[PDB]
Amino acid sequence: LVPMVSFDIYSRLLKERVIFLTGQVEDHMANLIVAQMLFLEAENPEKDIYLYINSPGGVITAGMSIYDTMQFIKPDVSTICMGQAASMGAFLLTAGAKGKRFCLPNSRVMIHQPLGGYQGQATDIEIHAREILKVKGRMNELMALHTGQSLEQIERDTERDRFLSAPEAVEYGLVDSILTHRN
Amino acid sequence: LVPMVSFDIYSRLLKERVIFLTGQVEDHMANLIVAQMLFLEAENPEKDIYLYINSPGGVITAGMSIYDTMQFIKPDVSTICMGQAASMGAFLLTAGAKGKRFCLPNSRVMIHQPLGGYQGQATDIEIHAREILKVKGRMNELMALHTGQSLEQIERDTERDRFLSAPEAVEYGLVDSILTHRN
Amino acid sequence: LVPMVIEQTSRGERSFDIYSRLLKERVIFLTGQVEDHMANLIVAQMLFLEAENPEKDIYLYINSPGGVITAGMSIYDTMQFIKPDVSTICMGQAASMGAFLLTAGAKGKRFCLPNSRVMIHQPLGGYQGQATDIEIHAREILKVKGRMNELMALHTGQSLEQIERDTERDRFLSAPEAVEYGLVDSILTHRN
Amino acid sequence: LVPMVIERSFDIYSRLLKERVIFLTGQVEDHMANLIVAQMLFLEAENPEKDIYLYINSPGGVITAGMSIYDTMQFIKPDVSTICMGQAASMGAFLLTAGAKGKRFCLPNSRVMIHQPLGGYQGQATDIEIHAREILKVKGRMNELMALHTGQSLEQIERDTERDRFLSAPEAVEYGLVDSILTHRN
Amino acid sequence: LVPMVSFDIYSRLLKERVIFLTGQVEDHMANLIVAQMLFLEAENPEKDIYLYINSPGGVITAGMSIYDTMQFIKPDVSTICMGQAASMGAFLLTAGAKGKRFCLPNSRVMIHQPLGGYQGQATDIEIHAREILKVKGRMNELMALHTGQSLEQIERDTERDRFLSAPEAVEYGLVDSILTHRN
Amino acid sequence: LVPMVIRSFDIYSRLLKERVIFLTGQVEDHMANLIVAQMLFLEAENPEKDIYLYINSPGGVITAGMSIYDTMQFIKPDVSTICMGQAASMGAFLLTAGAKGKRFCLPNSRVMIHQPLGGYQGQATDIEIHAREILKVKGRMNELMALHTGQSLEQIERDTERDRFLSAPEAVEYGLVDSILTHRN
Amino acid sequence: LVPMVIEQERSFDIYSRLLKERVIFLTGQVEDHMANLIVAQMLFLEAENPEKDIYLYINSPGGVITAGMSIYDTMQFIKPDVSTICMGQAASMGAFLLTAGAKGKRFCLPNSRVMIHQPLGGYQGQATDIEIHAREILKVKGRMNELMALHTGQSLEQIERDTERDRFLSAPEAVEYGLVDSILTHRN
Amino acid sequence: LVPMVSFDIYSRLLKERVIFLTGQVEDHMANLIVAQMLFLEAENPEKDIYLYINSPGGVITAGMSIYDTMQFIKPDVSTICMGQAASMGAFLLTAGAKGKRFCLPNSRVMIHQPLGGYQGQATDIEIHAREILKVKGRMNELMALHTGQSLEQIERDTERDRFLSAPEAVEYGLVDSILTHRN
Amino acid sequence: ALVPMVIRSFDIYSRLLKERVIFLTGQVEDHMANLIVAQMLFLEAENPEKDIYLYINSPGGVITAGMSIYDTMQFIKPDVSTICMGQAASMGAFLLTAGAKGKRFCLPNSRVMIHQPLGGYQGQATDIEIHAREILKVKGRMNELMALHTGQSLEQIERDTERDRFLSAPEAVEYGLVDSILTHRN
Ligand SMILES: *C[C@](*)(O)[C@H](Cc1ccc(O)cc1)NC(=O)[C@H](CC(C)C)NC(=O)OCc1ccccc1
Ligand SMILES: *C[C@](*)(O)[C@H](Cc1ccc(O)cc1)NC(=O)[C@H](CC(C)C)NC(=O)OCc1ccccc1
Ligand SMILES: *C[C@](*)(O)[C@H](Cc1ccc(O)cc1)NC(=O)[C@H](CC(C)C)NC(=O)OCc1ccccc1
Ligand SMILES: *C[C@](*)(O)[C@H](Cc1ccc(O)cc1)NC(=O)[C@H](CC(C)C)NC(=O)OCc1ccccc1
Ligand SMILES: *C[C@](*)(O)[C@H](Cc1ccc(O)cc1)NC(=O)[C@H](CC(C)C)NC(=O)OCc1ccccc1
Ligand SMILES: *C[C@](*)(O)[C@H](Cc1ccc(O)cc1)NC(=O)[C@H](CC(C)C)NC(=O)OCc1ccccc1
Ligand SMILES: *C[C@](*)(O)[C@H](Cc1ccc(O)cc1)NC(=O)[C@H](CC(C)C)NC(=O)OCc1ccccc1
Ligand SMILES: *C[C@](*)(O)[C@H](Cc1ccc(O)cc1)NC(=O)[C@H](CC(C)C)NC(=O)OCc1ccccc1
Ligand SMILES: *C[C@](*)(O)[C@H](Cc1ccc(O)cc1)NC(=O)[C@H](CC(C)C)NC(=O)OCc1ccccc1
């Protein structure tokens, strides 16, 4: 039940260089966002891309596919949180082009450390636990980079779930400003 | 089946600036409505959009994606309740352009406070409880803003489910008037 | 099948299951998850032994991964309420509700076996419902968390802030570490 | 159904308990371990001087449940002589080797298997670290005790348990896991 | 459920040194048979024990607990096959004291190699395959000893399921004679 | 569920002093073992005196049934069989396996006979092995049915290719039982 | 849980104890194992005293024909008269075993209800096997009708016609039909 | 679900000689990648193809249909890891044309030996075990070839899961360089 | 589901069909076999003189569904060239070797496996014997046709298929199952 304009409603919006990231982040939905990004860049390598984010979080490697695409392509990707951007969603929100990251007024942001799960031999448990610790550190480094917070601050603040209103997300350095009304 | 007109029935009405919000509010259906609003705003920034609402409620952050787009876009969003607008549905109904919020004569309205659920360590239970109580407070502030009721009245009236007929909804400030017959 | 035992009784021999037999040694086992019914059985055994002789010690062996707090507290309050000292002995593990009842034994009379392990942590819970009810239930679990820290602090001799700090996440303790922490008084190695 | 004996009535297992024989059969877990522990304590109360015979046929099980048995075998006064029939794998091999020195037996066609701990956790990275560190400590303690009972160096036990290792009964003797093969009743 | 003087039909027959092995061979039912053997040996080490076998097969290690107890205890264990002895059942049947192994006239025997199944890394697969092949060889050697067949013949005859009538089982050396009428 | 009489005995235990044994329901290893044990018990108590096996069964597993069949022949006492309700397939086979002159239907029982049913899954080499075996079994059971009924081998096989139902008088005419019990003498 | 009872000493459960007054209960769906328990109690009570009547209380929704016939033939074969008493209901196999009692000794409790009907069955298979199995259930149907006619005193034609669909009878109607002899009301 | 440029987003990028391998490697998804490669070769046999890889691994034989196609066709296949390339994903990454294998900066690579499982008669277990061992050695030989590491180093390093950062994957020889920003 | 579009429009498979290329992927069953048969019949109609390329990546499948493809391959006028990528096992290996003589290929890292039929039946002994006779007839016919295409004797095919038999691509050339290894496009 998706409406049409020959373009479906999202194809139409893709014409105004708008991409939607909605729901849990996972490989296949992430692949769709990456293809839209490479396409938009192909269409006009200089003009901004708008990425709307309404997401409860998701899988780290899937989110890192979108993150590296965002940094790799020529156009600035301007991120706009609507609804919520939690964990992986907060991370991609803050990864937008400096000065071009926005929360809508009543959107809410949440941040936290990695969660994972493994089963098997103690030797293998060691290998996998070291990996998720490595991953937690890189994520914190990147989050510190984009927010302007120190690495130590990000580590403390993400030990447990932390929720932030749109003004709190601005103050934290997570986004640059609230978008309220179309200028 | 969705009938054809070359549009499907909904695409055809989208041409009249008409959008339908039907069913449980959740991220993807919510994103469809946001895309339709953004599409219509692009087609004509000054012409009103009509949002028909028939909903038993739904997810708060999903609903707030719709709310913020309603307030962000240039066109006024006129809201029309058919069937029911309950909880998140009622919130988005009252969020329409002042003077352009309608109930159909036998539609019914229901308002209530958030419901949620979390499992985990006491420390985490406290973090999540804080967040749902904060959201409850903010949603009340916005309900008061739109209906014209005092914050305190709203709090009182939402502790448990409260049902309103179309005439009672007009009286409460939830809607501006009743549409009985077209002109 | 629980093995049984036959024993002279001056009114004839009668049969005792293995656990009934050990009750005559004044021994009670707490094994597995703590939950109302298994907890009630232990309460009942404690009350029985006190009636048999209010002045002789009881031995409570604990091998438990944890369990329900109110069920645990039915055992805790009974251990304090009855006249005899309840000596506690950890075998296998005593985790969470199990560590709590272990440390709750009569002072000087709480023991770990040498290769037992102890784990402590804060409460875990979960509610669903209206925000007003969520607050009510969150407030209750936070009340319980504090009361349980106060009692752990009491029994171990650590400060409340130390117990609070140490139980935010799961913490494991070897037998020597549990002695060093104040959780038990000593290690039992070879039958005294 | 458990056979009864008429004399005044024992099930087969209770009858053999009176001859100081306990059976550890199947996966090791808290409740069946509690039953073995209880039987050991009973036998000690009956006579702290006479040996106990613990027959072991087990594919392994839960480490803490196994350690309740291990520590009881060491704590009680009587020697616990262990006899492997069918198999003793992982926690079953550990309990077999933990028997009184000189009094650990394999039956001729029994087999033994040793390996390191297996586990699984789900949660925050912080919690994953806490749990991994604890499984690694357990792995080390279990290796130290295996070395002690077998006569192998800690290094050799660690190397030989990275992956499953099977031993015939003569191999379990050569390894120091048991003292001798029991073939026929003397 | 069993005929009762707690004291069932099986316990009365135990009084006459008769033990039944019925159904799939598995640790717990095997421990019961072991316990009955040791009991009977303690009662009288000189008198024969009678083991009726009606079994489709089962777990090798469970079976070996019985086998080794049969060899270890002082009394001779006489085996009698009723209905069938397949695989682990045929193995325990032939393991009875030579001269005291019997088929009833219309019982059937079946012999085969081990079946197994593992999942894991190729290194682990290699370890578990090596072990099942070791077990296959040891079991073939013991079958050869008990039947009087060569190792080569047992190997060739067990690569696939091989069925034997009671007279065929006498000819193969798996039992000593047919039991038809009590004298 | 099981009533008892009083030293205490359950109802079936009680009837066991009457030298009466019940075979009820699907024939399978464990219920068949209980019947075997009762037969062996009764022989030991008195090897001269007849045993009465009441049979009401829809059939069952062949090997389980053959444990009973061979025990019936092996023990010293005659086993007299009495069909109540029905004796179908393995039930009919054990009915006709009773001592000659001592096999009975009650007037409204019915007997049904049929060939073996089975099923295998595997490589074609294994399918052939198993199919050979079920056919060997089918033949051996027809040879035993012929022995007990007095019909020829080829005839029993013909009449059992499909399910065949018999009234009590028809079961007598076929040679499956000797007589019909109507009113206790 | 079945209540215990101590007879001045052995413990009988409620049912064991009422067996000493020669009372057996048939309750629920008639099936092989429950029906064997009834057969064994009948054989027990005959062995105790072959002259003395047995009382069989029936409260049953119906059940398997062959299992019912195990009980029917035992009722007829044993020396004692089996008196039947319906409480609650006796439907189909229950109604048949109720009317199978000793003539003059078959009763309904007043608010008993009886129902009668023809066999129901089902099969799946090749057409050849379908015909075999259809012919067998048609034979069983006829034989059950012949027996019902014998016990009720109704003609075989009446029985056949009345059992083509479920037919319900009050206890008064069951007396009038010949299904039971009389209504039992108070203890005399 | 798939944005409609007439063309879907993937068909559109196919025009740019871009193919996505996303998720578990399995016969049908692999056949789709094969078909795209064959098509791009038929379109221009001398121009590179770009294969974006975000995969947790998969079935070996499916992976090898891709591998052999990559080698067989006339164009070079440049591989680009986004998110992760694990096991079969890492193998296909490393099998890209020399000089043309890339990791995005926060992509992660993991290598390990085969996993398999089988159930059946010991004779059959022996056959299937021999086959997985053959496959393991063959895969090591090919990894050694593509990375420049010795066969013994590869064997040692893949007995258990080995994780590599993007710079570590460059050091290891799995890829040639890190891509960061579009030239 | 996702199949890329090429340009009036074509799906990726449709485009490759223009090159006379057909894919047989996964388990052989009636409906996927029917699609392959239809594609062959179409390509014959387009040009009865030009070769057809069948790529095979399959773990095996249903014999009668396989024979619908096999007989199509022999019936049609064009030579059908077969190319194994990934694996061709059992029914896959059979269709691979059924290709036109000299035009059967393995890619270098593909693997082949061959085995006798597997089946299963439940019913009366009379019926078991009918169905057992049928699967044995099928087994012999499939061995005859494998011997024909490989050039091996029928007794060789019978012996070698009694259990799963795996072959590397060079082994599959030595066996006569394919004619050569395709490595780089000419
Ligand atoms: C919860 C949130 O969505 C995080 C993403 C995240 C963003 C930013 C920072 O700094 C850390 C994390 N998502 C996850 O933790 C997912 C959780 C769900 C249940 C899929 N976890 C995940 O992808 O596992 C990562 C992992 C890495 C290495 C080893 C094992 C697991
Ligand atoms: C029930 C109605 O749909 C409400 C939305 C609402 C509107 C206006 C006001 O004042 C309050 C609430 N919906 C919910 O409460 C949903 C019910 C779920 C979908 C069953 N709850 C929800 O979105 O949870 C929000 C939340 C959870 C945890 C922490 C913070 C917020
Ligand atoms: C995990 C351990 O067993 C704890 C017991 C405990 C001991 C000592 C201290 O200081 C704190 C806790 N058990 C629990 O937390 C249980 C785990 C459940 C059974 C999964 N949780 C529990 O009993 O909930 C209590 C509760 C819930 C809601 C509101 C109030 C109390
Ligand atoms: C597999 C075998 O039974 C081992 C026991 C063992 C014996 C001897 C040595 O040296 C090491 C281990 N059992 C386990 O590993 C169990 C297997 C489960 C039941 C599948 N694992 C277990 O008890 O988990 C241990 C654990 C310890 C600390 C933290 C988490 C889990
Ligand atoms: C089919 C038969 O019951 C065999 C027992 C047997 C007897 C005599 C000889 O020579 C060989 C075998 N039982 C098994 O093969 C069991 C079948 C299971 C219960 C389905 N298999 C078994 O116990 O596997 C043991 C094993 C697996 C992997 C590695 C080593 C041992
Ligand atoms: C249907 C009836 O109960 C038969 C028993 C029978 C009695 C007399 C004659 O002459 C033949 C058969 N029972 C079976 O056929 C069972 C039915 C099963 C329980 C569904 N079948 C059976 O035991 O198969 C045994 C078998 C299978 C494969 C190979 C050999 C034997
Ligand atoms: C419904 C009532 O209980 C009848 C018993 C009955 C009594 C008196 C007369 O005259 C006819 C029937 N019970 C049945 O019909 C059972 C029904 C249930 C579902 C078991 N049916 C039954 O036993 O199968 C009948 C049958 C006979 C021969 C062949 C196949 C099936
Ligand atoms: C874990 C990773 O995805 C491997 C692929 C691999 C790549 C490179 C090297 O050097 C080794 C392996 N995938 C597998 O192991 C799959 C895992 C399954 C899908 C869970 N295993 C597989 O395809 O089966 C292996 C096998 C080969 C031959 C015979 C039987 C089984
Ligand atoms: C395992 C392989 O895929 C074989 C195909 C085969 C090819 C070549 C030769 O010489 C023999 C076999 N496939 C089968 O055996 C299928 C496997 C099923 C789908 C699991 N079996 C099959 O089609 O059964 C055929 C059959 C059954 C009963 C009677 C006649 C034929």
Quick rundown:
This is part of a larger assembly, with nine copies of chain A. Helix content of chain A is 46%, strand content 23%.
Please, could you describe this protein's structure?
Chain G: Keywords: Cytoplasm, Hydrolase, Protease, Serine protease, Stress response, Zymogen. Chain G: InterPro entries: ClpP, ClpP/crotonase-like_dom_sf, ClpP/TepA, ClpP_His_AS, ClpP_Ser_AS. Chain G: Fourteen ClpP subunits assemble into 2 heptameric rings which stack back to back to give a disk-like structure with a central cavity, resembling the structure of eukaryotic proteasomes. Component of the ClpAP and ClpXP complexes. Chain G: It is found in: Cytoplasm. Chain G: The active site is at 92 (nucleophile), 117, 166. This is part of a larger assembly, with nine copies of chain A. With 183 residues, chain A is α/β, with parallel strands linked by helices. Chain A has one domain (1-183): 2-enoyl-CoA Hydratase, Chain A, domain 1. Helix content of chain A is 46%, strand content 23%. Chain A contains seven helices and eight strands, in the order H-E-H-E-H-E-H-E-E-E-H-H-E-H-E. In chain A, strands 1, 2, 3, 4, 5, 7 and 8 form a seven-stranded mixed β-sheet that branches. In chain A, strand 2 (49-55), helix 3 (60-72) and strand 3 (77-86) form a beta-alpha-beta unit. Chain A is globular and about 55 Å long. The two termini of chain A are 32 Å apart. In chain A, 55% of the residues are buried. Chains in contact: A-B, A-D, A-H, B-C, C-D, D-E, E-F, E-H, F-G, F-I, H-I. The A-B interface holds A 1-5, 9-10, 12-13, 16, 18, 20, 22-23, 52, 54, 82-84, 104-108, 160-163, 165, 179-182 and B 2, 7-8, 10-11, 14, 27-28, 30-32, 34-36, 38-39, 41-42, 45, 61-62, 64-65, 67-69, 71-74, 123-124, 127-128, 130-131, 134-135, 138, 142. Strand 6 of chain B pairs antiparallel with strand 8 (124-130) of chain C. Bound molecules: the ligand *C[C@](*)(O)[C@H](Cc1ccc(O)cc1)NC(=O)[C@H](CC(C)C)NC(=O)OCc1ccccc1 (9 copies). One copy of the ligand *C[C@](*)(O)[C@H](Cc1ccc(O)cc1)NC(=O)[C@H](CC(C)C)NC(=O)OCc1ccccc1 is lined by residues 59-62, 89-90, 93, 114-118, 130, 133-134, 137, 141-142, 145, 160 of chain F.
